[PDB]
Amino acid sequence: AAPAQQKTQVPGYYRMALGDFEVTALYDGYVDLPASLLKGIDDKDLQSLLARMFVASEKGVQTAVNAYLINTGDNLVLIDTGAAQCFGPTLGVVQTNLKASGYQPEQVDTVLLTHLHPDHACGLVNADGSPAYPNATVEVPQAEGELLPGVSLVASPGHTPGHTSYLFKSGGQSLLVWGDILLNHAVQFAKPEVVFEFDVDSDQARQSRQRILAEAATDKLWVAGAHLPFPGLGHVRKEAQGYAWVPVEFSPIRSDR
Amino acid sequence: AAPAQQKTQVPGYYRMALGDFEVTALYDGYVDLPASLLKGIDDKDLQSLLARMFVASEKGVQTAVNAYLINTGDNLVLIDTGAAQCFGPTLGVVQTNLKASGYQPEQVDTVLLTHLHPDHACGLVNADGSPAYPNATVEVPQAEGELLPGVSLVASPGHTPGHTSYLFKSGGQSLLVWGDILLNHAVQFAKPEVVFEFDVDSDQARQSRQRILAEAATDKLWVAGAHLPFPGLGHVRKEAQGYAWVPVEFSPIRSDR
Ligand SMILES: [Zn+2]
Ligand SMILES: [Zn+2]
Ligand SMILES: [Zn+2]
Ligand SMILES: [Zn+2]
């Protein structure tokens, strides 16, 4: 006698203030990744780490893919673009969420890619072959502020040779849109030594991860992570061993802050 | 040259499957609570606990107020109703989010109150004096399933004498909509001994909290918490000392699960 269930999820966007900038986190969808792709750890310990965060793995680890839209006043900047249809119908929702968040793709004047992997770059092209962001300058990493006012490059090579993170600064606040520094929040904060099979260079990716985590924890900066649980926004805390992820708490943007 | 900032936040609803039931978490807004209202802990340790979770306290702890709408197939059930205008304009958004989530208040056939505090009960009445949920049977705690199919009472006295939690079970899964078992996730999971000044009976509230946390951790049940960071959904994990909150990871409702 209840009405039919609605099913539908809330739209995959989330707003956060960062000084005078506005951050809109955008969800692309998810992909199931086998836990066996994580290496450098015993099966038992891996499963314990997953169970600790109540992450199911029997049918693979459901992994989020996020992109970030930052309105700096000077520019509307999109970092990564999701996967379009490259990895199937559970992904490709970034542009839809961009629209849901109150912007249009024609407004994006800059697209920054952390790296060229499908789940970051395929979203540049619509199903009919038309450019998803037709008015944007697209920045591809090489295998005021600096790049733009308030926006600078933070090299983070390893996952791919040209893998790059982007730093946004406004009003004393900093946000690092870090790309694929890590793929599994339940394992690689606690044990950054753990690597991903599809890191092009796993040793290097691991070195960059250790460094970036140390810096993020030390400087208490905000992090925006392509494969962290959506909205993928939060801080890194140093633990006795390894690190912990602290996600932002849902909040409207406050005028009195 | 960027467009104007949108400001607006994504609507405050979140969908989760629980067996054959559908859970819609609903955000009422927030209230700033002084950290001085938490007792049983030194100032220093309290501040350390807050800083650990990156919770600002200089202007009070911004605290979420959540309600929960569960479609059990048999009933559309709302647990708590937010504050309406009882605590000012930063609250009172539950009904708005209920509408945003695709339901209408006329559809709610049952309202369960965890307790009679303003931030749970004031939402029963619209600004013009009309009933917010005019077709609902309202269950006030006394100072199949059992109450309804799949729905049972879990007494949790202390915060108020009649304070009550509600258990929903479907398809082997359980969700406890627990009310005000705790008020600050950054302090009272790690240190359940810490009490709230406006618990009517702080010793009793603390006993109920210890018991409920132990049970939630042991039985691995889902928890829906009125003052946990929205959507307020997740699990409780037992630590060497005290407990930890593990929030659900954003996900659509999956057909293949
Ligand atoms: Zn990648
Ligand atoms: Zn990726
Ligand atoms: Zn209360
Ligand atoms: Zn309350």
Residue numbers in the entry:
A (entry chain A), B (entry chain A): 25 to 167, 211 to 324
Study text:
Here we provide the structural and enzymatic characterization of the recently identified enzyme isolated from Pseudomonas pseudoalcaligenes dubbed OPHC2. OPHC2 belongs to the metallo-β-lactamase superfamily and exhibits an unusual thermal resistance and some OP degrading abilities. OPHC2 belongs to the metallo-β-lactamase superfamily and shares significant homology with other representatives such as MPH (identity = 48%; similarity = 58.6%), and lower sequence identity with the lactonases AiiA (17–18%) and AiiB (14%). We here show that OPHC2 hydrolyzes a broad range of esters, from phosphotriesters to the lactone dihydrocoumarin.
